[PDB]
């Protein structure tokens, strides 16, 4: 009468209750898949006993023995009858067992250690303007000085090249120099330069607070290609899973390169459990990456300690699918149950409850580290000035 | 033996080739589903004859007659042996036909006509102040310069020309080579200084407000956003899975949406997706078509690409390949589909038919040279004018 | 000699421009719900519609009420009074007239050199009044659909520019006369 | 078997459905009171027929005939048995009928026409600084000029009083004057004045955008006392209601003055219906005010056209209370039903549905009207300067 | 015949007078309920003897024994004939005792310990920059002035004193009476100008950010805010109507709150309101007491008034006067209560006992002289120093 | 004469102050999780705890790793190298020493007047290096709990101030000598 239900403790899908030592029956298990199996048995009416797999593996086949492990081996070999689990659909497993319509969608993704926030760097004061603007500003400064020079030499009413550059520079920094033009042609240039400076400096000053205090989080890898290029950084997957099989059976160049690396990368990058990879990433100073389904990353990044992050997008798109052995009478009703739950919106509510409901993760005065680059520039200019003065002194003395 | 393939004419899944009249048969059609069926037949090893659903409706059931219309109607009643079209998967259809594993995902999505972008011009640095203020500033500058010249001269270096220079430098806060010594000139200077201070402070503050603001506000931005308002009417496609989804919903928001849609005068329901697309495009922001995310994205990408998707998908579901209940073709088709998904084929096809066309390519960010190029143009104009006046003065001095 | 004649013709041209703009009714080109809103070419006194049911019939304006008739003596009523009276543009015209008269009288009594000085002062004051008038005109119209300005607007502006130029020239004439006196 | 239910059409409590001509039975009425009566009959079990009062009045007594009108007269005289209505509790009505525990709380309040938003006024540029700051600024300007004057006369290394004022003024406006101090004592004053100006002008410029574009909505009346003081503005109440009785039976001075005004204010300020007062306020150019319960104002201000507003606070606090005739067996259970609904939270849900769910009600470039005052000041200064020059010319000529 | 009056010692409804030991009887007690009962007796025409509830618990039922404790216990079992205390009205109590019409309203409210105000000092205008920046600015000013003097002098008006003046005026952007003519001096000047520009722009921008920001963020700001977090524990008063309200709730949020409270280690439930008040006051922001709005407001008003109320009242209810079921006193009491409410009496009493004490009186708003007084003090200090130095120079010149 | 002696004593005082501050270890007064955080008086080289389990025992610092040991050659590693080496304060001390030496040697060879000029240049460069050193010291410590600075900090600051003053005086001496030369 009771149905043999297979599962694994892959949180938040299946996880034991606190102080479960005093818990007995199916009540000792809480999670998303336990709930799901509850409603499936309700709609179909059967009874179920929640059972874990001793091997603790999702499932795979051994290319030499042609034997099935984990849930797939259990269902094919008769040890059970159904798997309301986070089992992943794939071609190979369908050849031997009958899946349902997926109850949640996913994709492969990459897990890395969260880098320390990049404190804003020296020369941060150039950020609010694009480098092209700075280049055009320099060109305009040169051009204005040259035009003033030519105008005041050819048609005067003194403005050499040096003093013209000085005047333009002073005008740009809102400091008035001792000399001012006396000719209409020079005064027009002065006026337009003044207007230009007003506009540019106002624009620069407007958006300057943001670019000084913002810390940007940047990862060394921004996609899978960036990962394949970097050989020092190590990446691995669960030993027996749709991920390893997908990499092994792939035909794209990138994934084939990854597979060669993994098959040759000693020590074995492969782990035996998801939490093992979680700890390895959390305990490798950012020297390790883990490939896994996106749902687990979403759960983890939404849960403390929040010391890791998801990078990039999903390499492939798939879905978790309930499974049943070939020829079972349960297979037909489970599909309809899944569709009914999807239409009712139950699955979305469960997702929100077990993922979003578990979420666990300002004007500051400027720090001297924020504006130290301008001090460095200042002191460098002073040293340059003293050096130039010494050089002029020597030249004059000769 | 050829296998009938019922489909539907909805871009980009299926489309009519340019110069379709000249072409005939399957070679006339082209779209995502076409390549999908080609690959499926290649992997299975059979041949297929395309065919369209006459009604043009995806499929549904008449509650009175209890009959099936559309592609599902053709498949149930033996007309067509396969349906490669974007058939959304639901409980009701799955009872009578054997769906395959989904080959694409989607959700219920809201479309709106793209609002005015209000793109910024090269002279975007004058926006913080009205042109009226700028011109009245110029006129006040002239007036104050004249008054200064006057009060200073009649019973001094404060001629008209130097007065204009002084007042300009004061406005720009670049100092003065000369300053008034008289009482009247000093009053004029102080008042002009006050005016300059106020005006420049206002310009800078308003500019900071401008650059720290973007027009990201959405008209609705939520499903209940559609429900609350009434000026904009939201409706669906008749004989489409979303209509049933609203009809059988058990939520407050969906119940209200269904009540409004079923009691909407005139009929919000449209005959075809293009009908609703044009309705929103020609509704002057009065229609809010509800459809599938795929079509919404494609349309928001295609020129004029004057439509936008708003909010998050209400629910999640996917298309699927269908066969008649008891058909022998159900088995391998699933397998084929999976092959494609694991081979990247479907991803390549999606990218090709949704992104390659690329009609239009549409926190704090640095300023772009476009925002501030007008002042550069002004500078160049002033430099040229200065050279011209230098030439004129040279000629005058020579003669 | 030439300078005085240029002064006089400029003064009379400015007076004519300002009087035209005051009497003329093509200041503003806006849509209003006053004609069966619809395109309308307004003015300082009367608002005249076009491309509508009237297609040429038009009337004065109720500047003080504006159909509101509230908030009396609240620093906004004063603006309304000033706008309706249009006292400042009229003052500008009067000052231009008197300045031109003084310039002309200068030819009669060349000994009294202060006459042109008074004329220049009058022209400058006319410019100030003109700019105040346009400021209040624009500030009142705020009480947002498209709008635009007509050629009477620019006629008033040209009057102001001419007034400034003429003030400069008259002051220069006074300087020259006093210098010749020594 | 059926219960006689009395109500009135005071939205949103009771209001007819759209196209009710085709509606029959109790279904033609929708609102808050209809729902409430539904759950009350459910809990009590009885049946009800929703009936309106022909007189269309809540209830009151005639001081001469000692007769009861509206709902109170109906229930006392046997024409009905219960009133699930927006009836207001009071001493007088309790003496004759039995109320329940209030199902919603309220208070008297004042309704006025929404004034046109006050466009920011001339001299708006002084707003970002308190007038005390401006006074201290003027005093500091005077003091700095005087100190510079004394220092440069007594201990010089020219800075008269006039030129000292000019220098200080130029420093305040970020314009450098031709002369600069040459003595240490003067230069210290200059430095502190410069720092003062930097700080003050930066503070002023920081918060200047807000004070230029904000439109402030201000009402001529800000409370009941301000209403009593103003006799030109007219205020009235519903003719037969707890409000009129409360004013009539009051003993506080303010309310007694109001009662004298209403009893003498010709034409009769009193209305016959709430919508009558709504229209009268909406059709009096802000010359009329209406006194009514706060719930109706909250509903109206939350509903278009949104051409009116609530002003001040609630003069008195009361609650709406179901009523029943003396000795009725329904009275005991209706109290329990009300308490059960309150505990369950139904009443809050109904309130939110019928009040909040019905709610129906930016960087702009500066307009010349915003900064016209500074233009006026400028032109006035120019006129003053010309006048002063003429005066000096006349004085010199004599 | 005197009527027993059971009450409870909770301020400000009932309190013990200063020097209570000397006093005895009703004259020893003082609080809102005292005046309320006095007025009720005056309007009814009887005399009353005060008495306290020994247990000190408001009232509740033991689910096993099915007995009543507290003031309700005293009233049901004939101990006391009246209960003028703040008895919250509920369905369970109203079955057995005759409540009167409520004389005050309230709701479930959340208390928190008042966070640090971070009050702004007179020298609040230096806040946008670290003191480190200011002092390093001073040191850089000295260094650049010295370098300028040096480069200019050793083979000019650029002495050390004039160099300091020039660099100061450059930093303040007030111009210079003199400017460098040499290459080295001009390099120094340009670099100092760059530094000044960057630093002043940063100061102004950060100051604008400061003045357009206030610390209004609340730790929870909602009922579900308490549920989500776990560092702060929320509990109620045992034997208090709020405990039952949570116990019998049918909402998700209230169900979760009840689950947490009933399974809270250590016991969140407190013996008395002062217990929870002290728990939050000495929890270092670890306790979130749930109580009635009246007590929360009174406490947030009384010194130290270091506690704040957060969020809106979860539900609405009111106190009420109670009598035994079948008592003859029920009739007139209601009437009396209504009289008071219609006579403004209860409003006056509430205002007196909640606002008159006034221990502590705690969108864009103009700056207050307090924000910027430090610069005025600096100005006065500089003026005095200038006068002193003038005197010193006068003495030196004389000698 | 007096001025040269004041120069020399100021130079030696500045050198002593700077050397003390470098060798001394009472720069910063902060809490850290390095002693069984707890109050700690740190320094340029070694961090020494107080009022803790050690109550006087203390050790050097791992400036380059900081227990992170990541992001090499990224413009932050250079700051760490500079902070650890403390090359700039040491350079300031060296320059002060050499300047004092040149000043003293001036008394030996009064003919060569450029010696004091070199000394003044060295003092100014010492000031520049000192300010750079304090800047990098403060910038590195960022890598927020309470903190405070000790008397070695102000000793370095006083060294800088004296260096500036001495540079001024030496330049003035050079001016006087060259003027006397004529
Ligand atoms: O009696 C009057 C009337 C008047 C108008 C003006 C004037 C002018 C003007 C006038 C004459 C010219 F030859 C050139 C320009 N332009 N202008 C503007 N703007 C320019 C174009 C507009 O579309 C947008 C902003 N805003 C406000 C006022 C204004 C100046 C003085 C006077 N005195
Ligand atoms: O080798 C060194 C070390 C050093 C330190 C400094 C210094 C001084 C200082 C030094 C000596 C004095 F006589 C007076 C002041 N104060 N100061 C500050 N602040 C003042 C008080 C602090 O608590 C908050 C901000 N921030 C950063 C640096 C700094 C200047 C030069 C040098 N050169
Ligand atoms: N449930 C998945 C897990 C694989 C993985 O985590 O990579 C499977 O059966 O393959
Ligand atoms: N229901 C209230 C209405 C009174 C009013 O609106 O003023 C009553 O019975 O008095």
Author numbering:
A (entry chain D), D (entry chain B): 393 to 549, 570 to 773, 783 to 819
B (entry chain C), E (entry chain A): 389 to 543, 565 to 771, 779 to 815
C (entry chain I), F (entry chain J): 18 to 53, 79 to 185, 196 to 234
What does the literature reporting this entry say, word for word?
AMPA glutamate receptors (AMPARs) mediate excitatory neurotransmission throughout the brain. Here, we present high-resolution cryo-EM structures of GluA1/2 TARP-γ8 AMPAR complex, associated with three diverse TARP-γ8 drugs, differing in size and potency - LY-3130481, JNJ-55511118, JNJ-61432059 (herein referred to as ‘LY-481’, ‘JNJ-118’, ‘JNJ-059’), occupying the same binding pocket. Modulator selectivity for TARP-γ8 is determined by two residues unique to γ8, Val176 and Gly209, in the M3 and M4 helices.
JNJ-059 was also captured in an active state, with an open channel gate. Therefore, even the bulkiest NAM does not compromise an open gate conformation, underscoring mechanistic differences to NAMs targeting the core receptor (such as perampanel). Based on a resting state structure in complex with JNJ-118, it has been hypothesized that NAM binding precludes outward movement of the M3 gating helices;40 however, the highly similar architecture of active states in the absence and presence of a NAM suggests other contributors underlying NAM action, as investigated below.
